[PDB]
Ligand binder design. Sequence first.
Ligand SMILES: Nc1ncnc2c1ncn2[C@@H]1O[C@H](C[C@@H](N)CC[C@H](N)C(=O)O)[C@@H](O)[C@H]1O
Length: 288
Amino acid sequence: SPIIKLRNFNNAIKYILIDKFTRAGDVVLELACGKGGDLRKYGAAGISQFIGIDISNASITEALKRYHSMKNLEYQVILITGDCFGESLGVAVESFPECRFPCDIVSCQFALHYAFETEEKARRMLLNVVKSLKIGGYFFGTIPDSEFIRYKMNKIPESVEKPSWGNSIYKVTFSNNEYQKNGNEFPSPFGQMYTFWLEDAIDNVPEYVIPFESFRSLADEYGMELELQKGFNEFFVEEIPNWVNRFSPKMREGLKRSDGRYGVEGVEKEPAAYFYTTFAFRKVRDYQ
Ligand SMILES: Nc1ncnc2c1ncn2[C@@H]1O[C@H](C[C@@H](N)CC[C@H](N)C(=O)O)[C@@H](O)[C@H]1O
């Protein structure tokens, strides 16, 4: 089962990415925060307030349960059940006036691509982000890498009805081959759907491509400029020397490969390190 090693790798990526842009005293808004599993990472950066929002009440209930189990934190934690992509964020936070907006950081891990189901949702997400963020603040996170996806798709001929690739532990299957029928181009940046099988994975939902060039050009339209687009492989290799020994002994041990180097290995390398990319934008102007 690859789940344990992949979870450790993603936790290392998130730890490094959070530290890269988050500063002590910051207010953080985390979109689609899930079960709130990055609280100690933001605590390590010394934040002052965490606001986490997820559409799943079950996941927010678990985040509440995990948070209340911790003791004497120096930062406030706010956890909200709400829709970050298909509705104005004002609806979600209306009943939470303790939120300190505008915030310093908007983060979103393994979830922003769901906002690309439609153009309306992608734009609502982006307007949500820039309305919450201070000028100068950062928007960062982790998403499936549309450029690796297009590489794999360009190797698949039009004769394949449901373009697919993978290895012993994962498989991507697209709903249709309109990409290939359209001369190896998505007919629309939005609504390009696939499923993702991972061995021993605990969830399965419709996935959507987030074409990075469309992401970047919409973000610019809403006042944000690109700061970071490194794939997980390059991001980890570049950053790990400076971090190996800053990690806890347990985090370091969980990252060990069979050869004693750090990261993932074998069949885990492609789904864990090539399929995903980091992103970061800085809000440089107000949106008109
Ligand atoms: N419209 C939406 N608004 C808010 N959260 C959403 C929405 N659509 C999906 N989600 C959440 O997106 C999350 C996707 C997860 N893959 C990631 C959760 C968490 N960020 C983690 O990395 O563990 C789930 O927790 C969903 O409930």
